[PDB]
Design an enzyme around this catalytic site. Structure first.
Site, mmCIF file in Angstrom:
data_model
loop_
_atom_site.group_PDB
_atom_site.id
_atom_site.type_symbol
_atom_site.label_atom_id
_atom_site.label_comp_id
_atom_site.label_asym_id
_atom_site.label_seq_id
_atom_site.Cartn_x
_atom_site.Cartn_y
_atom_site.Cartn_z
ATOM 1 N N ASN A 115 31.966 -42.337 55.610
ATOM 2 C CA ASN A 115 30.837 -43.138 55.139
ATOM 3 C C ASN A 115 29.562 -42.470 55.598
ATOM 4 O OD1 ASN A 115 28.957 -45.018 54.263
ATOM 5 N ND2 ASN A 115 29.606 -46.613 55.706
ATOM 6 N N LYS B 180 26.682 -43.282 54.789
ATOM 7 C CA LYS B 180 25.621 -44.284 54.846
ATOM 8 C C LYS B 180 24.356 -43.755 54.122
ATOM 9 C CE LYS B 180 27.630 -46.422 58.953
ATOM 10 N NZ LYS B 180 27.304 -46.982 60.290
ATOM 11 N N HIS C 90 31.144 -53.977 54.033
ATOM 12 C CA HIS C 90 30.777 -53.181 55.218
ATOM 13 C C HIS C 90 29.850 -53.987 56.104
ATOM 14 C CE1 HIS C 90 28.979 -50.029 57.748
ATOM 15 N NE2 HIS C 90 30.105 -49.378 57.524
ATOM 16 N N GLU D 298 27.179 -53.572 57.613
ATOM 17 C CA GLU D 298 25.760 -53.502 57.309
ATOM 18 C C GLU D 298 25.391 -54.372 56.092
ATOM 19 O OE1 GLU D 298 25.606 -49.231 57.412
ATOM 20 O OE2 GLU D 298 26.017 -49.327 59.577
ATOM 21 N N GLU E 106 36.265 -53.091 61.524
ATOM 22 C CA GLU E 106 35.061 -52.615 62.212
ATOM 23 C C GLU E 106 34.758 -53.500 63.421
ATOM 24 O OE1 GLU E 106 32.530 -52.804 58.324
ATOM 25 O OE2 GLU E 106 31.578 -51.404 59.709
ATOM 26 N N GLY F 176 26.507 -50.370 68.944
ATOM 27 C CA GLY F 176 25.115 -50.356 69.397
ATOM 28 C C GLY F 176 24.719 -51.328 70.501
ATOM 29 N N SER G 42 33.713 -46.659 66.500
ATOM 30 C CA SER G 42 33.346 -45.287 66.874
ATOM 31 C C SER G 42 34.565 -44.341 66.950
ATOM 32 C CB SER G 42 32.590 -45.284 68.205
ATOM 33 O OG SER G 42 32.308 -43.962 68.630
#
Lengths: 246, 245
Positions: free
Chosen positions: A9, A11, A93, A95, A163, A169, A209
Site C-alpha cells: 500500500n 498510500k 483501510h 485511514e 491492522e 503512531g 508495522s
C-alpha cells in the site's frame, strides 16, 4: 493450502518518475512463484502502474464507491478500476475509517458491489488504542468482519487484513504473538459464522508495522498468511518481505 | 472576464466512452472568448490529459491538503500537476453533503492547491432548508469567506454557485434567481476583497444547464459561465461552450 500474499500500500506517495523507479526495481526482483504480490498505487496512477508493472504483480485501487456510475464527484467505481487493468481493491483501510469517517455500513456496500463487479477485495479491520485498553478487541474486529462477511458471496476473491490501529503512531508496538492471537480468533470466527472451508482457505494478512527484519518471524505464525505493507512498500525492503517464507 | 465552461464528468465513463467524448471535444471549434475545462474521474485524469487537445484544460474532481502522506485513497495537488492537469474542483456539494467535508478542510485544501500552482474551482451553495429559512446570503457569504481566507491571488480561482436546494427537491432555479445570487456574490468580493477582484473573477453557475437553457443563463450580467453536470458527457456540452455566441 493457503498461498502467501504480500500487498504493498503506497498510500498517498510518489510521482510518475519516482514510482517508475520503484516499479523498475520490483520488475527486476525475482518473485517466488508461491507468493501472490499486489501493489496499490495512488488513484491518479492506477493506469500508469498497471502499464509499467510486470504482469506477475497485480494492481489494486486504494478505495472505491458502491455503485457503477453516478453523481459522486471525486469517487471511482469498480468498473473503472477493472477498466484500468487492476484486479483488486483495498476496502475499509484504517485511514478511510478513522480520518475520512467511513462507516461499517458503507464499507459493506462497497464490498458487495466490488465483488459483484469481478474485483478481488482486500478488506481491512482493526481496533484503536482506546478500544484495546478496555478489552473490546474481539467485539470490535468480529463486528467489523461480520459486516464484510454479510456482504460476501464468494471468499475465493477476498483477503482479510488485520491492522493493529492501537499500535500505529501512538507510542505502542505489537508482538508476533499478539498478531497471531487475533488471526487465530478471526479464523475461528470464519469457521463458526460462515463455514470451515472458508476458514481454512481464506488468507488473513497482517497490516501492522512490517520490516525486512520483522517479516520472517511474523510470516512463521501459523495463522498469519502474509502482509499489507505500508511505508516499507516504498523501499527495497519490500523485496525481502515478499521473500519472508524463503 | 473570459467566459468559463467546466465539464464535471462526476463518477461516469470508461476509456471507450470517454475517448469518444474527447474525440468530439477535440473536433469542436472553441470560441476565442471562452476557456474550457474538463474534470474526469480520478482514475482517468492521466488518460484524459493524454487524449484531450491542449486547448482544453483538465481538472481533478478533488484533492487532499498535503503533498504526500498516510492518506490511503487520496491524491495531492503534486500528483494532479504531475499528470498534466492544471485545475482542481474543491468543495463540490457532493463532497460537502455526501462525504461530509467541512469548510475548514475545504479552505485548507484551497490554500494547499493554490500554493502548489493549481487553479481552483471553489464550489459553494445552500440547501433547501437553508433557503426556506431565509439564510441563503448567510450560508453562501460564509462559504465564500473561508475560500477567500485561503486565496492570495484570485487570478487562479473561479467561484461556482451550486443551488443545492434545486437538486431533486421539487424546486428549481430560474435564471433570475441565479443572477440574484451571482450579483450578491460579486458585491461580496467588491466589499471584502477589492473592486478589481470583483470585476476580474469569473463566477460560474453550477445548477442545471442544458443546450436549451444556456443562452439565457449566460446572458445574465453576473453569470460568467458554468460548472456543467450531466450535459458535460454529451455533444450538447459544445452548445454550452457556445452559450455566448
Amino acid at each position: 493450502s493457503r498461498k502467501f500474499f504480500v500487498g504493498g500500500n503506497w498510500k498517498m506517495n510518489g510521482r510518475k518518475q519516482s514510482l517508475g523507479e520503484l516499479i523498475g526495481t520490483l520488475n527486476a526482483a525475482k518473485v517466488p512463484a508461491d507468493t501472490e504480490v499486489v501493489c496499490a498505487p495512488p488513484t491518479a496512477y492506477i493506469d500508469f502502474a498497471r502499464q509499467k508493472l510486470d504482469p506477475k504483480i497485480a494492481v489494486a485501487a486504494q478505495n472505491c464507491y458502491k455503485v457503477t456510475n453516478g453523481a459522486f464527484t471525486g469517487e471511482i467505481s469498480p468498473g473503472m478500476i477493472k477498466d484500468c487493468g487492476a484486479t483488486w481493491v483495498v476496502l475499509g483501510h484504517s485511514e478511510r475509517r478513522h480520518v475520512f469517517g467511513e462507516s461499517d455500513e458503507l464499507i459493506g456496500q462497497k464490498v458487495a458491489h466490488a465483488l459483484a463487479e469481478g474485483l478481488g477485495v482486500i478488506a481491512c479491520i482493526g481496533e484503536k488504542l482506546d478500544e484495546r485498553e478496555a478489552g473490546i478487541t474481539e467485539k470490535v474486529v468480529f463486528e467489523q468482519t461480520k459486516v464484510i462477511a454479510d456482504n460476501v458471496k464468494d471468499w475465493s476473491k477476498v483477503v482479510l487484513a488485520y491492522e493493529p490501529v492501537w499500535a500505529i503512531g501512538t507510542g505502542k508496538t505489537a508482538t508476533p504473538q499478539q498478531a497471531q492471537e487475533v488471526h487465530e480468533k478471526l479464523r475461528g470466527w470464519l469457521k463458526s459464522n460462515v463455514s470451515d472451508a472458508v476458514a481454512q482457505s481464506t488468507r488473513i494478512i497482517y497490516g501492522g508495522s512490517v520490516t525486512g527484519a520483522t517479516c520472517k518471524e511474523l510470516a512463521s505464525q501459523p495463522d498469519v498468511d502474509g502482509f499489507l505493507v505500508g511505508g516499507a512498500s516504498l523501499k527495497p525492503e519490500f523485496v525481502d518481505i515478499i521473500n519472508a517464507k524463503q
